[PDB]
Design a protein around this ligand. Structure first.
Ligand SMILES: CC(C)CN(C[C@@H](O)[C@H](Cc1ccccc1)NC(=O)O[C@H]1CCOC1)S(=O)(=O)c1ccc(N)cc1
Length: 323
């Protein structure tokens, strides 16, 4: 069983350290349940974002094996191109030998330049991995490096220490109640069916069901712009001159929970969770069209409230309230 600590960066990004190569070269990577590729910047990249992050040097690793396979990924924000290679990845105390990963050759755009993390370690299904690159957790399981084909994620609140990805294990010290299991609706992302979103017993969005993904790599709770617009109005958030969805901090103590019904079970978010305070809305409009319909994204705003188990043995997501 492997424990990967995550840094909680301003309740917005959760990344941990990995080592690649022999001897290990260290990188910070987002542990991203909304994608499936592992990649880090490399010495082959001249993009600005590569220049201000750690760059992998295959020349200094005695276990690196080159390939001729190219890689390209487009994220919601950010993108990269590169080349695939094999090396040993140290993650969560596990020696992930023979791991294919992307060595970046381009990383355009400001987002990756200003981001504190070097790269991305995707934790979703192989079917959405660019160039069919074996995801890290698939390689761990293939090699028998975890005994149970699952991992769990605890994301801390209030910029606290303690966030972890637990590879091959479930730890009930991080939750209370009993885990409820949600079947994966479409294997790709960790995609599930949402039944409804309610507030004070009234349906405010997702009437008749909607598709959502559970995504550690997304900070906010996002949905189709139309539905989110109604939600913002429902809670009293309005856009600023600066484009910020401003909300009165007084409403944290007066507003009711917003309740997500998933596989028939109610998962409330208190206003303390869906209002960010330092006050702005934890909801964001973002349109994600797919074969299954527009995807909602249950990002860190949601996951901070529910210890989440990602079970590849039976293709289910488990949820329970955080301790
Ligand atoms: C660390 C990155 C990866 C963060 N992204 C989250 C990832 O989980 C992201 C979620 C997503 C899925 C499908 C459509 C759109 C977005 N996956 C993603 O695009 O996967 C790629 C490869 C497979 O299919 C598409 S983000 O959305 O770019 C993002 C960027 C900046 C902010 N402030 C918030 C979110």
């Amino acid at each position: 069983i492997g424990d990967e600590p995550l840094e909680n960066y301003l309740d917005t990004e959760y990344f941990g350290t990995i080592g690649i190569g022999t001897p290990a070269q260290d990188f910070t990577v987002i542990f991203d349940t909304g994608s499936s590729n592992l990649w880090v910047p490399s010495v082959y990249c001249s993009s600005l974002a590569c220049s201000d992050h750690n760059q992998f040097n295959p020349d200094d690793s005695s276990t690196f094996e080159a390939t001729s396979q190219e890689l390209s990924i487009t994220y919601g924000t950010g993108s990269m191109t590169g080349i695939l290679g094999y090396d040993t990845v140290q993650v969560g105390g596990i020696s992930d030998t023979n791991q294919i990963f992307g060595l970046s050759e381009t990383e355009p755009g400001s987002f990756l330049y200003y981001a504190p993390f070097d790269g991305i370690l995707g934790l979703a299904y192989p079917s959405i991995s660019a160039s069919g690159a074996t995801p890290v957790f698939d390689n761990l399981w293939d090699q028998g490096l975890v005994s149970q084909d699952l991992f769990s994620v605890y994301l801390s609140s209030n910029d606290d220490s303690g966030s972890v990805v637990l590879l091959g294990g479930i730890d009930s010290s991080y939750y209370t109640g009993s885990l409820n299991w949600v079947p994966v609706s479409v294997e790709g992302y960790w995609q599930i069916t949402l039944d409804s979103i309610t507030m004070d017993g009234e349906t405010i969005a997702c009437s008749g069901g909607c598709q959502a993904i559970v995504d550690t790599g997304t900070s906010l709770l996002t949905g189709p712009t139309s539905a989110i617009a109604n939600i913002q109005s429902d809670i009293g958030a309005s856009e600023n001159s600066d484009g910020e969805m401003v909300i009165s901090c007084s409403s944290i103590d007066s507003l009711p929970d917003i309740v997500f019904t998933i596989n028939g079970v109610q998962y409330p978010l208190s206003p303390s969770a869906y209002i960010l305070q330092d006050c702005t809305s934890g909801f964001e409009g973002m349109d994600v069209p797919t074969s299954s319909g527009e995807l909602w994204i249950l990002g860190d705003v949601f996951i901070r409230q529910y210890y989440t188990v990602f079970d590849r043995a039976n293709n289910k997501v488990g949820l329970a309230p955080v301790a």
